[PDB]
Design a protein around this ligand. Structure first.
Ligand SMILES: OC[C@H]1CCCCN1c1ncnc2[nH]ccc12
Length: 167
């Protein structure tokens, strides 16, 4: 039993909700919140920009030190950093950005990072400003993640479509 509330159960381990991931994290304080990161961990907009804003830019400061030490992530890769005031940890995961011409096949590799954590709060990878079809992203999530994932979809209209179209 966990403290996630109001989710629709899609499969044995994948749940979904129309919610602002920032407000969800602040309420639940999960062990792991997933960020929709880029390889440079520059958290300018979308999910990443909103989460970073909620940390008062502490996420960005920590991220800049991580990049200065380690260099950029790989598309499809991840790193674990602090969750600051939002969660114990933040798993920064890089899904492909279609608006950069990045291979959509790397979306499965991106979701594989979730399997290293027993329970996560997360957005749909490569959705929103990353330019991929959120319906496709949900399919890859369900077919790749085996651990318990609580998915937050900010747009109410998109949420209804993901549910109604969910096979
Ligand atoms: O709303 C649409 C979804 C899917 C794609 C990208 C942004 N989305 C988000 N989901 C959950 N929390 C969020 N906070 C800020 C953005 C956001």
């Amino acid at each position: 039993v966990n403290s996630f509330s109001g989710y629709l159960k899609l499969t044995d381990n994948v749940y979904i909700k129309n919610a602002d991931i920032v407000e969800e994290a602040k309420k639940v304080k999960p062990t792991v919140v997933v960020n929709a990161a880029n390889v440079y961990l520059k958290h300018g907009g979308g999910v990443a920009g909103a989460l970073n804003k909620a940390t008062n830019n502490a996420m960005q400061v920590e991220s800049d030190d991580y990049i200065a030490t380690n260099g950029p992530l790989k598309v499809g890769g991840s790193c674990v950093l602090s969750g600051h005031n939002l969660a114990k940890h933040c798993l920064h995961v890089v899904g492909p950005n279609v608006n950069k011409g990045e291979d959509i096949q790397l979306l499965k590799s991106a979701y594989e990072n979730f399997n290293q954590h027993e329970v996560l709060l997360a957005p749909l990878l490569s959705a929103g400003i990353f330019g991929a079809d959120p319906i496709h992203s949900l399919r890859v999530c369900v077919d790749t993640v085996r651990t318990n994932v609580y998915l937050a979809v900010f747009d109410k209209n998109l949420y209804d479509k993901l549910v109604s179209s969910f096979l």
